[PDB]
Amino acid sequence: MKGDTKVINYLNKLLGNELVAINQYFLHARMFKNWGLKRLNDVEYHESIDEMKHADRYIERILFLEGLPNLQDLGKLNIGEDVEEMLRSDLALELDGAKNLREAIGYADSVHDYVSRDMMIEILRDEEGHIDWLETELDLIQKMGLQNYLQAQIREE
Amino acid sequence: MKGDTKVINYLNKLLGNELVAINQYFLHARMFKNWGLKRLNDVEYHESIDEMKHADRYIERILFLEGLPNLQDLGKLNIGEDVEEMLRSDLALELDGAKNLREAIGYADSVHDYVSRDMMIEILRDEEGHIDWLETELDLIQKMGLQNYLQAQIREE
Amino acid sequence: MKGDTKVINYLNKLLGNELVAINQYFLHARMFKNWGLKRLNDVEYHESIDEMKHADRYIERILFLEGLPNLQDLGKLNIGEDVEEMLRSDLALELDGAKNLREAIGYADSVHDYVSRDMMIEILRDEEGHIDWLETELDLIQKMGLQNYLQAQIREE
Amino acid sequence: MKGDTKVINYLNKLLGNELVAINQYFLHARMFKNWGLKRLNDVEYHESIDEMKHADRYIERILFLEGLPNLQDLGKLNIGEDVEEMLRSDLALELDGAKNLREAIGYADSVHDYVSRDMMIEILRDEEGHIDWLETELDLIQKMGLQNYLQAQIREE
Amino acid sequence: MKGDTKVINYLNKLLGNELVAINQYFLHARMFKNWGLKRLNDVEYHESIDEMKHADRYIERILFLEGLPNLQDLGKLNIGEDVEEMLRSDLALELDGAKNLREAIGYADSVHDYVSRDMMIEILRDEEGHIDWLETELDLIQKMGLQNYLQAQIREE
Amino acid sequence: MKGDTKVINYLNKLLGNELVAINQYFLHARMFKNWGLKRLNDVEYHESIDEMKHADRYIERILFLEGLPNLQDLGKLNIGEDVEEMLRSDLALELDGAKNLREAIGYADSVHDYVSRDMMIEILRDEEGHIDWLETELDLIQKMGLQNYLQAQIREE
Amino acid sequence: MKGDTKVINYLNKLLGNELVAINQYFLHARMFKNWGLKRLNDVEYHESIDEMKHADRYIERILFLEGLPNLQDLGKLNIGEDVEEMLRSDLALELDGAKNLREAIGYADSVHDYVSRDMMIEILRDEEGHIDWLETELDLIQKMGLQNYLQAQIREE
Numbered sequence A, B, C, D, E, F, G: 001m002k003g004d005t006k007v008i009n010y011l012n013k014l015l016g017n018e019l020v021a022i023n024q025y026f027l028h029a030r031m032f033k034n035w036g037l038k039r040l041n042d043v044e045y046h047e048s049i050d051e052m053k054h055a056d057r058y059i060e061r062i063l064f065l066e067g068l069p070n071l072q073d074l075g076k077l078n079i080g081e082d083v084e085e086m087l088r089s090d091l092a093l094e095l096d097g098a099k100n101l102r103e104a105i106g107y108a109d110s111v112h113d114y115v116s117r118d119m120m121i122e123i124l125r126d127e128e129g130h131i132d133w134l135e136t137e138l139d140l141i142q143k144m145g146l147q148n149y150l151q152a153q154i155r156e157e
């Protein structure tokens, strides 16, 4: 069913955001796992899988709309070297992604692509969940101190 | 069955205390949940449901005695901005509540409303349990320090 | 994640509507139960619980958006003294609430708060169910007459 | 297998009767559900479904006989505005349809289409059950009065 | 254990109230069953049994206190001839019995018979439930009229 | 609850679309079944049931909004005579219906009927699935040729 | 445990080959799904998951050896527009990848990194499975012709 060209361009842009987040969260999860921070590996691994499922939904929607999914153009990763810097980099990426989502959702409504919009709102709700988790962990580091915070990560929850 | 007017007035006063406590505990619980303090969310939410059940018991008893439950006049909430201030505010509210309960219990006995009295003694028992929990947590903060105490709240028990 | 100030104000106003509805429905449920109208007790009790669940969603959303939930300012209850008066008061209240809901949903969209919008649309759907139930009962009183209507309430459904 | 032209014409006539009855019973059922008359929604929905299965049987039989089922020419619905008027309209429609069935059954026998005949007799048996249910409900309205009658419809059977 | 003489006298007075109520409720229940009012037979039979368990508790307590249970002096029954008169007679009897219970409870406290007191308060709680059921039924008769009220009694609940 | 008059008009137009689609998908299904194309019978039968469920949602919504469902005015069927023509006819009908949905969804938003809008977006989502299925089948016929395509339809999936 | 620098570089190169394969196979899988070729969607999806699992083993090994996994530099995708082109492209990618693997396995042995070698031989055996499946499918297209081959993909296996 031929979709609106600019809607397909926005979906490719959001797919590009999910591709960056997949790699960044998956690498962060295995860095945490290597350091023995099991709880953080578990959450970040599951965050990584959520972004993979988001990428799948964009890929299928784009193809349904008769566009060409662009899995070629990976954007900048910001890996970071310590726990706080890693979580802050994830959070910055998420806030940028939500901004792009909000734009695409408004546009999709104005051209009456309500099914693309409905899918993007469900994805945005998941992203707000990822944001909440990141903001909360960053705050906990501040309130209990990094040493207590790291000790809390060693067992799976 | 027409009840004593002053007993109905005391029951409405106690109902009013429960209404404040329901709101204060429920909001505290969701504040803790938002901060990622799961154990405190769990306990405060259950303390909140306990007060809801107390409020139910007063409402039914007042109607049985042919009075008019007053759910309109909400007393002052004292929310607080940090863990210790919140728990201290719940404790202050509970202690004021137990005082009113003791007074009503004595009076119900004087006019031979022993069933309203039996109900109030059971609620007072529950309130002494909320007080015990609050006092103990405040003492733990002091003994282990705030950072260790916060760390201990992040997993459910 | 910092929310739009006016969205938070709308959320607090809708929360205020839920708090009124919780109390009014709960007290009506127990009045019905005291009169031995078990079926009306059951339905009104379940609507009060639905409104409690709505209040909880507003509270959690306001806190996530970094605002202050206002559980202090209870609006006017209109209790009523007989079955038809009580149902009509619940109806007027629902209709006023639905009006404020529609206004907030439109505004959430203008500022791209699509998750708050998506939440409030699910709550609106629930409110339209409460309205449908109230309007239907009111029409049944008219069609079968009050005595038959009361008779049909004495057994739980 | 090439069927008799007039038999196919009769089958299309009866299919037309079924298509009117599907819509009329379905709409009556949902009108009853909207009014809170659950018992009547339940019966009329199930009659609607009976008529749908009758239509399916005509369609398949016409196809087997190498004819063209006509689902295009919808006959006149008579919806009605209150319970008695709705039931009486369903009854008039069923009586008309039974008269057409009797004629078609006679004709199928004279051209030796005994399988079309046997199908139509099983459908006529179901229609006589529909007529019996309608005649009985209308008589109950008279005997107990409309107010008691409507009260009797509010719960599922 | 030798009990207080007046406490035993009060226990025998209350036992006497129970013995009247057993007979009156049992006979009312069977009168209702004979008339085909099954719901009322069911409730009144179960009230009869409650009173029997109350009597058993008085008998055992008087024996433990080294007193002589008096099952000889049956007080006045007031049976009544129609549903409302029967219920109103049960209610008057229960109100009288509650007044005697209140007096005995006050007295047991002043002589430090706290276990007799605790038993009597549990019995008073059950009696207030009996009073509530009666008051509610009598009000239902008024609100829906006697004919609808009797119709509502023909099936078991 | 009194709905917006133009919303009810749109709901009636959409209902009219579903009614055409019910009949056309149902007749196509049984034509495939008669031809021994069991796979196509199964899919088209399930699409017809999907449109019946859509039609039920429109009817209940219009009644809730105090409108009159119009099941009388059946639009034009285009049945077709061979597999490819029938599929193309279903596709043209679906695309016209999706255009009407988009218009109604926009309008519903402008008058704040967010629950009617929410219902229509779910239905649109289903229609886009119908569309995808039809487009895919039509492309398969071209890719593998009609003879292989027919062969693939004889067994149930 | 500090690994050999050139081993880590080989590991990063092979991880790069997996990242290309994950994307190419996943998009191919969803392209097949869109065309209604379910059997091809299923196999290519499961091959993509295989590559994801390989990527994970490289990442974990590189971190264990204290190197930095490079998930930033994505190599050239060759997507293709029809089934045969897409399969040939996956085949070319696989053969290039197996070449890089053979080279790395040899070198791991020269520097006594036998655990890296053991991991890479297991991945190579999986890659030879992917190669076998692709060569086999390409040969089937030529032996049965593309129309029959496409017909054979529409049902899942």
Ligand code: HEM
Pocket: A019, A022, A023, A026, A049, A052, A053, A055, A056, A071, G022, G023, G026, G049, G052, G053, G055, G056
């Ligand atoms: C186009 C990019 C990718 C897409 C679309 C994608 C997609 C998916 C999907 C749909 C699943 C199934 C998840 C579920 O439903 O449970 C999955 C699983 C998985 N993915 Fe990816 N993924 C991508 C990239 C990656 C990358 C780069 C890694 C690198 C580690 C990875 C690692 C995994 C792992 C370990 C699993 C679980 C496999 C298992 O044990 O079953 N994925 N992926």
Ligand code: HEM
Pocket: B022, B023, B026, B049, B052, B053, B055, B056, B071, C019, C022, C023, C026, C049, C052, C053, C055, C056
């Ligand atoms: C008049 C004031 C209230 C009364 C009398 C009341 C009463 C009740 C009662 C009786 C229950 C059932 C508890 C049980 O048996 O487990 C309940 C549950 C609940 N209440 Fe309230 N409540 C009141 C106010 C509130 C408020 C202000 C909130 C705000 C959030 C709230 C939130 C809840 C929640 C989330 C539940 C659990 C419902 C569930 O099962 O999911 N209540 N309440």
Ligand code: HEM
Pocket: E019, E022, E023, E026, E049, E052, E053, E055, E056
């Ligand atoms: C009119 C006179 C009385 C009648 C008609 C009556 C009748 C009955 C009946 C029909 C039962 C149920 C029996 C069964 O099927 O198991 C019962 C139970 C019982 N009765 Fe009576 N009774 C009378 C007087 C009394 C008195 C004076 C007592 C003094 C204690 C008494 C004590 C009990 C007790 C303890 C039970 C068993 C209750 C339970 O635990 O379920 N009854 N009676």
Ligand code: HEM
Pocket: D019, D022, D023, D026, D049, D052, D053, D055, D056, F022, F023, F026, F049, F052, F053, F055, F056, F071
């Ligand atoms: C107003 C229009 C129609 C409406 C509203 C309607 C509605 C429905 C509904 C709600 C169901 C039950 C679906 C489920 O939940 O599984 C159903 C079933 C069915 N319908 Fe219709 N339908 C309509 C027209 C038709 C027509 C013209 C046919 C012609 C055959 C038909 C044939 C059937 C059949 C065979 C079933 C399944 C019956 C069974 O075996 O239980 N319907 N319909």
Ligand SMILES: [Zn+2]
Pocket: A018, A021, A050, A051, A054, A123, A127
């Ligand atoms: Zn995402």
Ligand SMILES: [Zn+2]
Pocket: A021, A051, A094, A126, A127, A130
């Ligand atoms: Zn995310």
Ligand SMILES: [Zn+2]
Pocket: B018, B021, B050, B051, B054, B055, B123, B127
């Ligand atoms: Zn309390």
Ligand SMILES: [Zn+2]
Pocket: B021, B051, B094, B126, B127, B130
């Ligand atoms: Zn408390």
Ligand SMILES: [Zn+2]
Pocket: C018, C021, C050, C051, C054, C055, C123, C127
């Ligand atoms: Zn609500």
Ligand SMILES: [Zn+2]
Pocket: C021, C047, C051, C094, C126, C127, C130
């Ligand atoms: Zn509501």
Ligand SMILES: [Zn+2]
Pocket: D018, D021, D050, D051, D054, D055, D123, D127
């Ligand atoms: Zn029929």
Ligand SMILES: [Zn+2]
Pocket: D021, D051, D094, D126, D127, D130
């Ligand atoms: Zn019929």
Ligand SMILES: [Zn+2]
Pocket: E018, E021, E050, E051, E054, E055, E123, E127
């Ligand atoms: Zn007793």
Ligand SMILES: [Zn+2]
Pocket: E021, E051, E094, E126, E127, E130
């Ligand atoms: Zn009693």
Ligand SMILES: [Zn+2]
Pocket: F018, F021, F050, F051, F054, F055, F123, F127
């Ligand atoms: Zn549809």
Ligand SMILES: [Zn+2]
Pocket: F021, F051, F094, F126, F127, F130
């Ligand atoms: Zn459709």
